Amino acid sequence: MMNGRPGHEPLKFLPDEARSLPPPKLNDPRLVYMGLLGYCTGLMDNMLRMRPVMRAGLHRQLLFVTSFVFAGYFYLKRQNYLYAVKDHDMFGYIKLHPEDFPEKEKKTYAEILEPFHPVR
């Protein structure tokens, strides 16, 4: 839906306007979970090859953990940027069309007559 928007670069993973956003924490819970999945991938790989699950290939286990965190950080940056753009467009569109989004003056419950439904 957003692909044809103004100022859209083709096949750009991280547009330069994304550098105004705060970067994710390196201990972001989503990045901690990514590294945990990489650790599980290493253990599952050991199991499938009939190796000692925790002991074998700590170098292979470390690469699995680091790759998941490394990839996840940059993907999380791109996902943060796409959500920020979505809000930038939504609110900007709301301002250009104030007739489609009126401020609805709500009434207090002193004036509203809700029906009473007796429980019995």
Partner 1 sequence: SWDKDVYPEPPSRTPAPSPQTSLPNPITYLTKAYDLVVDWPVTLVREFIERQHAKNRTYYYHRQYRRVPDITECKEGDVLCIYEAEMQWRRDFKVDQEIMNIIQERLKACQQREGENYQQNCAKELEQFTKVTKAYQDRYLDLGAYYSARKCLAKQKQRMLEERKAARQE
Ligand X SMILES: CCCCCCCCCCCCCCCCCC(=O)OC[C@H](COP(=O)(O)OCCN)OC(=O)CCCCCCCCCCCCCCCCC
Q: What count of other Cβ atoms lies within 10 Å of the Cβ of residue 19?
A: 10
What x-and-dash track marks residues 91-120 binding partner 1 by CB under 8 A? ---------------xxxxx-xxxxx-xxx
DSSP per-residue string spanning 59-82 = HHHHHHHHHHHHHHHHHHHHHHHH
Residue 68, C-beta contacts closer than 8 angstroms, at least 6 positions apart: 34, 35, 37, 38, 41
Distance (Å, rounded) from C-alpha 64 to C-alpha 58?
A: 10
What x-and-dash track marks residues 56-95 binding partner 1 by CB under 8 A? ----------------------------------------
**Contact with ligand X (CB under 6 A): which of 13, 33, 83, 101?**
33
Interface segment toward ligand X; rule CB under 6 A; list 25-33, 41-49, 67-75, 83-91? 25-33
Q: Is 1 in the site for partner 1 (CB under 8 A)?
A: no
Task: Identify the burial level of 63 via C-beta atoms within 10 angstroms of its C-beta, where 0-12 means exposed, 13-18 middle and 19 or more buried.
Answer: middle
Cβ–Cβ < 8 Å for 5, 88: no
**Contact with ligand X (CB under 6 A): which of 4, 7, 22, 29?**
29
Q: Which does 49 bind (CB under 5 to 8 A by kind): partner 1, ligand X, none?
A: none
Residues that bind partner 1 (CB under 8 A): 106-110, 112-116, 118-120
Residues that bind ligand X (CB under 6 A): 27, 29-30, 32-33, 36
